[PDB]
Amino acid sequence: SAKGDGVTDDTAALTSALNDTPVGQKINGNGKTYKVTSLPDISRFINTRFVYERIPGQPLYYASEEFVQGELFKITDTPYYNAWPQDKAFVYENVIYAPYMGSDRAGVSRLHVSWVKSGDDGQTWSTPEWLTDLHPDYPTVNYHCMSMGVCRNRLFAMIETRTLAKNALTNCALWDRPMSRSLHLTGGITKAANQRYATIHVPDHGLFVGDFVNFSNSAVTGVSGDMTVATVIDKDNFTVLTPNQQTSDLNNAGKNWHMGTSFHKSPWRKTDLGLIPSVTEVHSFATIDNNGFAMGYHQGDVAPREVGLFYFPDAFNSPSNYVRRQIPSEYEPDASEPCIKYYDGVLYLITRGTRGDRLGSSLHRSRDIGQTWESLRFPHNVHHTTLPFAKVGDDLIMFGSERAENEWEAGAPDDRYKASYPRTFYARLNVNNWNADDIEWVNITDQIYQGGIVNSGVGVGSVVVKDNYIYYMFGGEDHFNPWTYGDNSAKDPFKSDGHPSDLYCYKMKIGPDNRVSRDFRYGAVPNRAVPVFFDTNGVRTVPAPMEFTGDLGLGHVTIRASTSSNIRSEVLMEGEYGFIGKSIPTDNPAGQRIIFCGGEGTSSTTGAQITLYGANNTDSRRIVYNGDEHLFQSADVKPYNDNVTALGGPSNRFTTAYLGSNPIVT
Amino acid sequence: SAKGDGVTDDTAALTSALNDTPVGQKINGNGKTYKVTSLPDISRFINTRFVYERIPGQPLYYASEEFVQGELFKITDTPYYNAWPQDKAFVYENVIYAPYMGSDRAGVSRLHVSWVKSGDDGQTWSTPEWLTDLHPDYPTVNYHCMSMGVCRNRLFAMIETRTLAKNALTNCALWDRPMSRSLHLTGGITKAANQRYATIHVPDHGLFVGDFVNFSNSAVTGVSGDMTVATVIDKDNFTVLTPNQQTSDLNNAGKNWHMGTSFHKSPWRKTDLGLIPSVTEVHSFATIDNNGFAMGYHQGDVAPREVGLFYFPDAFNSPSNYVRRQIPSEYEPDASEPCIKYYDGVLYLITRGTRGDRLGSSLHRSRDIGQTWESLRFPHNVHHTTLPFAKVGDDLIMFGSERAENEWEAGAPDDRYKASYPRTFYARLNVNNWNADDIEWVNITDQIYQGGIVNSGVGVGSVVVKDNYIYYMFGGEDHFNPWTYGDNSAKDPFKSDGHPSDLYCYKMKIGPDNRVSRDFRYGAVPNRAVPVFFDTNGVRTVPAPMEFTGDLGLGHVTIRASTSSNIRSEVLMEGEYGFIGKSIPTDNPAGQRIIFCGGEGTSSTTGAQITLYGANNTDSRRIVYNGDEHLFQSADVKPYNDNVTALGGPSNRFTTAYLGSNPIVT
Amino acid sequence: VGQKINGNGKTYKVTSLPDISRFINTRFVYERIPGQPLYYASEEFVQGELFKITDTPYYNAWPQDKAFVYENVIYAPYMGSDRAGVSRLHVSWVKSGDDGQTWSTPEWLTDLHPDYPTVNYHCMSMGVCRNRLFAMIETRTLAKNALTNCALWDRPMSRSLHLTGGITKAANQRYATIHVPDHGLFVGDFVNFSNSAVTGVSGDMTVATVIDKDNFTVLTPNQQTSDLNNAGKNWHMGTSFHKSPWRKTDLGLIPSVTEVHSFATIDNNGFAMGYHQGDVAPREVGLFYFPDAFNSPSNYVRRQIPSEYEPDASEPCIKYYDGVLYLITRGTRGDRLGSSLHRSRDIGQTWESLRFPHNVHHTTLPFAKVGDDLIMFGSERAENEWEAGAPDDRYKASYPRTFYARLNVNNWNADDIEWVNITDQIYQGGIVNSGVGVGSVVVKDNYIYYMFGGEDHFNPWTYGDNSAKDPFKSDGHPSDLYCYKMKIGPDNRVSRDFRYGAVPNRAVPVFFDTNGVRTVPAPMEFTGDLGLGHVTIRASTSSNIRSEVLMEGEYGFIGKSIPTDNPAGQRIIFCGGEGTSSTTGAQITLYGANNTDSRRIVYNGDEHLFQSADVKPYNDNVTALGGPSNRFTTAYLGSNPIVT
């Protein structure tokens, strides 16, 4: 009989337990931890944790179902290489944002900084949105982002420019943009008599001149509908220009009204920071207060290695000013990509370890935004994974993932070029006790590493808390080879199964849920990406505007009435010029031509026709113009060249010519 | 330890229990009800119900998981404002129908009366089908429907016309259509010698003249394939006109054959009822017998208020004949939108309460289809929700949803303009006991109210029973703002996340299931809406006909051979006229032009060309016609105006003119 | 509604089926038909789960018996048609790269036959032998489903190989020898090379010659003065299913064959394929063994099961484990002896046999061997058809039962076999045929997978408005694929299970662009009739200088429909500019016959320049230049008019 104390070997007791248990009946471990010399059939346990040393001296923990209140979700399913949520996730006004990079490789080729969002606490996720376009100088360089967050109602992001060839950092820019909001306000709008401007009082609006603002029911004439910020007075007040003026002062004190902001309608503010000295990557984001934030960084190109943060004390007035702070030099070797968060006046920082044979991930806290630090190192050379985290009560809750199976432990070699099932872990650390000696890494889910290339999209995620749940957004692969070694060295995502990397989210309960469940089974046709409705005629209909940028082959085509009170069908051609041409036919090239007709059929009885004959046609490059009237308006009918071509011929005579004078013969 | 008697305060015992048990342990309540002064961590309980007074003196009940044997499903996911299944759901020949309205707001703007269907007892749902088009007089008026059902194999619906400006009723029409069926029959067709009609015996066929009927293996010559109903003899007999005749009488007695009906291929029968006096909304549907049905209604625009039903005793012969029957006068104030159902000679009616500070939902039963009533009032002013229901055994099983969190209780004010989690309830009422004093509203699922606008799409649903399961189809939102106050006051569904309201279905066990589970996890690529197949050369191929009505941007386009034994590629343009034009270039505006070519390339060596130059071109509005022959057929070559334009010019001379006679001057 | 009950993994005898969903971890034994006990599992009694794996408008059925696992990927091949027949049929598959949790967009493996619609393809036998897919591709008539031709099609499977050495290149010549053990490649097959360390052996190449089973040569575009050898150096290859052609071996109309069905890999050289003959008497059931499919794909030997087991039998499933070939038949009729099981240690020359009790019929019994047990799956095609003597029950909707059973091969006795009903499907009932069942079985790791058909309640309207059986009208055809995933050994890892919460974005990959508009970057083919609204053709071609539309066929046609409201306005305006106003650009307007100005053409530009040819009337001495009310001002000529 098992003791469940986390020290006594219960392997034998649990083996007998399973043998006495009906085939496919579950053993309840009662929330206890059981020491084992081998992991048993974990699927036949509930409410059970195992402690096991795969490598002697390195105990790790393994959760059966129901031991933690949690669940894994798959959140993207796209042919791009979708990975690196690190470390960009945030929650804004009830919506969970999972930003990432969708590329074709571990590099910036075909890369768009992207996000998916959840509007239902993680149950379902949105169609991916591209946040960046391809760099103007693609394919020499392209964008990259591992640091993104919100400060005073604006999205802030460190948008890097990196080379395709080498992934070398060339530029850093701070990009920011107001977040979309709906506000229900009382008073705060004033408009002086006999002039057109109105002043809008909105505390911490976070808007700049030119940003979008929408007004409804303002009760101040002219302050209405889609508008823009004309001036900024201070952080709580701005003005707008109205189209009109009144002979009396206007004020809406005590009246309820609506505003009115937009991410989509407002431009990015882009602040070029140039080539920042001694930076390899900017990574992670911690909002400090109403004026600024910190971003993590490391330098791992030359000795000595740097790990720390950039603090932007006033990102609104001074986006180009930041303060570089480093962690103690003892912890900087063999470290990268710090995760940073700020709670109750304390800045916490956790490093990634570069290798399993050297001291790895370490934790740091600061009460002066990185000037001084208290530090500790995690045992057993934690490496290859970032450790995104949040603080809940006295605990830091951190998540990490090995990139391929059995790489987590100190001294464990990289195991690539073969399919495996990498373990994802979480751990708690009490901040009062400040001691990681006995930290317990709990394996809560396993991912797939594909093995077709050396690189892994598994892990390197990001963590957020919303209400009583914590969310770890991270990469995982599947068994579909990208055929980089094979027929797709070009890494085209749209061939075969594209790239196996996609995003996942582990949702874990971290406090009481005092409501009845919101959970549902998704049984709908997904109808947001390409919204389809069977029309009254039984034909699939897409009412959304769409862009098809890949090569298209179409069958029979009808252009419906669409434009100018639906009077006309319309096709517009872009570029410097448009070209409508005719392929060389397969079976009868001698028939190559296009018939243009003002009527419904190929018979010229249905309307006027012009037929352009191809060079392959029996009648090479012929043109036949066939109407019951040929009317040449606004210009002379001329030959292109001088004294080269004729009007008519001996076998094609015009009956006569109707003229206002004799011909001019020279 | 807790008593679980619904009367003893069990708060302290449950808190102690929760403290003493591991978080992954599901505390089993053994189906009992526990009185609490605050709701505990519900997620940690199984088979437990709580009774709690959020508002003193108003106890409500709260289900942990596995207390009711039910599950929530999401059943639509489209950008439209998808709400108001009220009260239209029905089951027909093994298929569950969930009709609704997909609009852009609480109103008729952009509205299509729609449905989704389930062919697997609610596990998965189909691509939305539009049942109505936009009204001929859109955007002044559009359709609206809250009453729909089936009577003798025909769909019947009250199709309303309402103004976009005010949502005011302008017209009521009864629309009906035969439902699609396949019948596998033996005998029943006769055809008299020397004439062409055949008589088809199908009891209660429900077809009218002109309705679609398909025949297979009839063994009666000429009764074959797609046909239509020629005459209707009576409710059990109709004729078809065949294309042929025989010399002896035909009768397929004893022979197996197939029919034959189609919703899609049959027209609506539309009966104009004008503007029915004293009606605000027609809502809910109760099939009475083989001949007719009732539809609920209320009048709430002027005083005094009316609530009742319209009975259509013989909708087949007399669709214009309806009988107005009100509920008792004292239950009409502050009431609307009655749900009606008919079971074993009893008509049941349940009202919606208009406000929480006045007597609300009431229940009524009648043994004479609404001529006389027995009535009861639900305690505590039930308001803002319809209460759709079914009868199973001795119990009415009713479902309701508050529109926003904490609105259910009597005296509870509306709580809008902030995100919340509205409670959905069900309750049983024993019809023998006929007393609602002790009714128990059980919170079984929570929805989301978004809060970006005052209106809520939550709830207002519909209920059906299929086999041993009850289904509540209803609205729910998510956290995605429609940006009505923001960049989308126009409420375009296809911008951003469109509208958050979508449909859900709660599926609850109400009787024994004598089969092994049909349950599956859905792991397929949804491939009905836009059916895609990777063809043998690895390109995504869509074989379905489609309509793309939204603005379309295309890249490189190839129009394949498609028409007249695939001899030609074809584009047809609709409207009064077609327009093919050229945008102003943004790189080189002075190059603006389109090249039309009878060959494969831009070089005129490949085929005859006509190039139309834009006004922005350096050669403003030039036309170059370039072929090896220019042949003008069927008409004179003329200038558009008289004595204004010339043939040739001083630097563009024709060599000569070949004429049958001298020029005619002037 | 009864409170839920834990049955503690026990089996209970009952005279009526109980409220099954009331129970957890319980099995019931019940004799629906007296003397024929069957077993019924409540939730959680079996460690297993059902998945829906296709959802397309085609009639998706007949995984039988083609499923296989290759290098971590589970393949579920099937036929997507419009009926029980070869009309509109493509041999297709879906795949899982996550141990059955999620499945891929359907891929068509075959096109329509060159002689469609007289004949089309059909396949019930597919598998892998030495890194090549092998399939028996049948040609059958649309009219009668009659077999006209059998062909063996084979193709190398896509692989990525991470190797060390094996590439040698002799000096002064270009051919390089590549050493890949059991490569299974032929001349012309695709090979990709990376980091070879041998000059010229690089990128996309093809096999030039095959020396033996372990060595082949490639032709490089260069040569070196010294010998080359990458022994001790790491490099990459390099194979492709899609970029290599099929090898097609015509076997003609194989005599006495109705269907080829099922696939058993024997060794590194060959395999067996099951068959039956059931159109003429006497019936045949057995296998075809291809001992050397690589050198001699046309060489096969016919092996029948014992004669007493051939009547009333079809569609054998065959598998090969540890020197023994196992075969299980499908029964034709419930009133005659049905499914039987056979084993052979000499590839079907001699057999040991047994009969399953109670006339098992209408189902194939695909299976695998796990330890001492055969684990087999079957499905009745409609509800209550399974039992001996049970009549077919079609033309009404029902819930057919799916079963599995174990059979210990040491005991070799099926008398006490326990068929366990693990899941129920839907049979729609709109037509007599059923897509339910007829599946395929694979094992991957500690899980067994049964891939099979099931329908839903949506009528195809064959009897109704869709006798043409067009999949793209209404809900198309109800048959789609499912997969039951059952645990068959310990799982010593933490769970990989997830809830799928993503937008499915493989079939039609959509991304909201930076302008907020849905964007599809994948190349696509739309073959169904398209109706389009406002269309903009974007710059795409020749360093994006131009927008481009190319028209195929013998000729292209751009025309104008007869207008509904104003037919007197029928025309198309072609414009070099942005708007309908001629101020924006040169215009040519072609008027329809319905227009007030019937078949008028107006050419409107600030220059009309006729290049490369005379301006001529089509006919001789019939039409004029100008008219009495449309005079040209003059004619500028190099010489006086030539007048008749």
Ligand SMILES: CC(=O)N[C@H]1[C@H]([C@H](O)[C@H](O)CO)O[C@@](O[C@H](CO)[C@@H](O)[C@@H]2O[C@](O)(C(=O)O)C[C@H](O)[C@H]2NC(C)=O)(C(=O)O)C[C@@H]1O
């Ligand atoms: C949609 C459509 O048909 N647009 C055509 C318009 C259309 O008739 C509008 O109602 C405006 O007229 O007309 C265009 O053509 C004019 C002749 O109708 C245009 O050619 C002008 O016609 C003269 O008015 C005239 O005397 O009738 C005057 C100008 O010399 C002449 N201008 C030019 C540039 O030719 C139009 O663009 O307005 C053509 C268009 O397809």
Ligand code: NA
């Ligand atoms: Na991917």
Ligand code: NA
């Ligand atoms: Na919606």
Ligand code: NA
């Ligand atoms: Na199907």
